[PDB]
Write a protein that binds this ligand. Structure first.
Ligand code: 2K5
Ligand code: 2K5
Lengths: 281, 282
């Protein structure tokens, strides 16, 4: 049995499960409809539901509870996937969260590549939102550890929402990419995970945005990536990316972690650049 | 026959006392290259600063054969401004010295690297591409396929003139530590078919090298992984400070179907037009 929390608990008869969305962290994610989440008790809200797979262990359960328990503490923000409720009693654990219909930022940016289109201002606005979301998480003393476009979900209203916050190097993703390519060197070589190692990952995410879902270091294996980092190599400036925005990526990848910008600084600069970026191209 | 004596060609032959050897320039193809001074090449008493290619002391009868062949080919190919031309030779009574034009500003890659901002204008960069294409178009008309067209094999003269050099194993790297497979067309790299259209692809990689101001192609990418990129039909990212017309030209050179790539005559025509429309103000 799991303990009951009435602040969040939803009766199972108020949740109609739909088509699966795909595999998530610590379990699988399905589309659902929740009858009366707030008044109105008669309104349906389209939501996302995470539960365990049939092959899951007592360890996989504890992980899912822990993530839910953390979301309770972290609190609400527009640019994070928020908790909406849970079915913890009389059956399997269903963690009810916000639903993002346009998938992950990688897929979204890829699907909108030229032969719907995004202007330069729209791309800067994507970076702004992720930084706003990360700055909130940082204020809650939370370190993501895997900030990438794949872990940023886009809603129907093009709002960016950071997913699964708070590992073998030769383990690839579903799309066949290597997650080591997003890691700060100190996290990779010294296993030191800080808000400053997440800032390095935001630098890789920025590159991902301005390349419209480009794969970082294509054809580069793990042993060769270490060689690039040790040599102090940095990714080439994307085409259709300002010198101010490349300067920003390079600051995020400052060799010295203490010399990198913070998320509060990134939010400030990105706010200013959005305002000065034309929506005419 | 060439073991004891080489045949004489008086159209090119120079007396050895008319050549004063100087500081070595580096290792070249089929031998080594040294700086030299030739007393009266034309007509008389004037010294011309030249480049001299000869064999290393450890060279074989096969290495000699190769050097003679390159000289013999240069005799056939004829003169052009955008190629390293033959000036003469010492073939008799001592080791073979192949006397050629001298390019003081080194190779295009080093040239472009040394001139990176912390200068060459956009028009200067397009002019580099134009010259290489003019040089390759001349070589193509002479039924010659380079097989290793890269910035490293393009010499730049005192007067900034581009000159193609040494015009004809996958895990063999260069002196600067780069992999030459990163310049070859897929047909040359899988079916071993080397054509003028293969040199058009290598010109595509050279153009990328120019607009990245001596950028290293696919950094940290090994050979087996490069094949995977080519088979997947991956194409290098558009460089920063490179027009969409110039990137599309790179992409045209990088066409999977060799017959659908532009020829050097087309490249010369388009570049001629672009140089004229490119501002020297930036
Ligand atoms: C901390 O953030 C989360 C995020 C999630 C992901 C829920 C989700 C899926 C979704 N929409 C889409 C769109 C396209 N493809 C998918 N696939 C499933 C998926 C995405 C992610 C991220 N994890 O699983 N979901 N929006 N919101 C679940 C969760 O449960 C404890 C907490
Ligand atoms: C078919 O084209 C050639 C090109 C050459 C290149 C000779 C050369 C070198 C040179 N100037 C410099 C300047 C700085 N560093 C070097 N390095 C030697 C070098 C580079 C390359 C390429 N070949 O030799 N050469 N000017 N002309 C020789 C030759 O003799 C058979 C035939």
């Amino acid at each position: 049995e799991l303990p009951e929390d009435p602040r969040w608990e939803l009766p199972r008869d108020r949740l109609v499960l739909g088509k699966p969305l795909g595999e998530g962290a610590f379990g699988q994610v399905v589309l659902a409809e929740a009858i009366g989440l707030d008044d109105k008790p008669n309104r349906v809200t389209k939501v996302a539901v995470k539960m365990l797979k049939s092959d899951a262990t007592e360890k996989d359960l504890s992980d899912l509870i822990s993530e839910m328990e953390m979301m309770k503490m972290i609190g609400k923000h527009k640019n994070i996937i928020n908790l909406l409720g849970a079915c913890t009693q009389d059956g399997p654990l269903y963690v009810i969260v916000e639903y993002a219909s346009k998938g992950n930022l990688r897929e979204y940016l890829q699907a909108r590549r030229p032969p719907e289109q995004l202007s330069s201002k729209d791309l800067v606005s994507c970076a702004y939102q992720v930084a706003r979301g990360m700055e909130y998480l940082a204020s809650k003393k939370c370190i993501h550890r895997d900030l990438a476009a794949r872990n940023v979900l886009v809603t129907e209203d093009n709002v960016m929402k950071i997913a699964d916050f708070g590992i073998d190097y030769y383990k690839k993703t579903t799309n066949g990419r290597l997650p080591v390519k997003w890691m700060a060197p100190e996290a990779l070589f010294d296993r030191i995970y800080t808000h400053q190692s997440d800032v390095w990952s935001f630098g890789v995410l920025l590159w991902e945005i301005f390349t419209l879902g480009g794969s970082p270091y294509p054809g580069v294996p793990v042993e060769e990536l270490f060689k690039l980092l040790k040599e102090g190599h940095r990714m080439d400036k994307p085409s259709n990316c300002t010198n101010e925005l490349y300067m920003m990526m390079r600051d995020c990848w400052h060799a010295v972690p203490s010399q990198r910008p913070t998320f509060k600084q990134l939010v400030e600069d990105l706010d200013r650049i959005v305002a000065l970026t034309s929506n005419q191209e």
